[PDB]
Design a binder for this molecule. Sequence first.
Ligand SMILES: [Au+]
Ligand SMILES: [Au+]
Lengths: 153, 156
Amino acid sequence: HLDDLDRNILRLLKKDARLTISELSEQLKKPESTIHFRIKKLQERGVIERYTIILGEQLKPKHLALIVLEVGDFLERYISYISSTLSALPGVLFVAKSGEDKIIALVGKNNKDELVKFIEENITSIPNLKHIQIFPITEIKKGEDLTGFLAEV
Amino acid sequence: HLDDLDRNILRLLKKDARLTISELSEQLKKPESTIHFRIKKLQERGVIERYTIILGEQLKPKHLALIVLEVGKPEDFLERYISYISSTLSALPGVLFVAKSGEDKIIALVGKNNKDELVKFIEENITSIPNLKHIQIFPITEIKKGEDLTGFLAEV
Ligand SMILES: [Au+]
Ligand SMILES: [Au+]
């Protein structure tokens, strides 16, 4: 399906999605036609799903915590309720189900006491409620751009 | 300092960064030269940090897991030991995502294609790490907010 030309195109566009057809041709030493037709195929077959931007600077939250929460058939539904409630809240960047059972959230605020207060009013406050682990993120070694990607507004 | 027009431009670009200035000016009802200037300015200040693509399900990992490691004992040695495990993990295929929590934990996001490749991954690269007090594995069953994370982090 994908050969090395497709993969090289995708790698360049992951670093800088502004790169035009003549630019990729000059960087990849392939004719402009060839590249044009490859890109057009990656887009029609959904391999490139979407073009977006990474936010930097004053729009990445300063303090991040990862939270894993465990609730104690009504169960499918209660996790659905908690997770839509968390999804609607500002500074909640990522929400996922895990097993039956569990919710993973990444939350971010600009003040650490604001992040404590937020946990504490919106998460530790959920009824039935067996366990919660909070993992404040002190540094990111790989995937630093994730915050700028998930960050809203 | 950001105003409503700054935010509105960013929202649309976060939506679809293929949107050109003339399309943004039509959608926002602002002269083209204002949009243009605002975009150059956000790019210069690093508010728009980077333009990227999100990969489609052919290149996304089908099975994702979050891993939480807690080190028992490697204080200057703890810091250095975590760096070592961080760098070892980062160099591995499928590793999305590595972060340090507090002085003693490593958080990783791993994608593979089966259950299975993940089990085999944990056998080989996680339970082989010496001096770990705790290992937790949280399979991602369903992403509710942020589903395009794995298309963003997917390596090719
Ligand atoms: Au916290
Ligand atoms: Au395992």
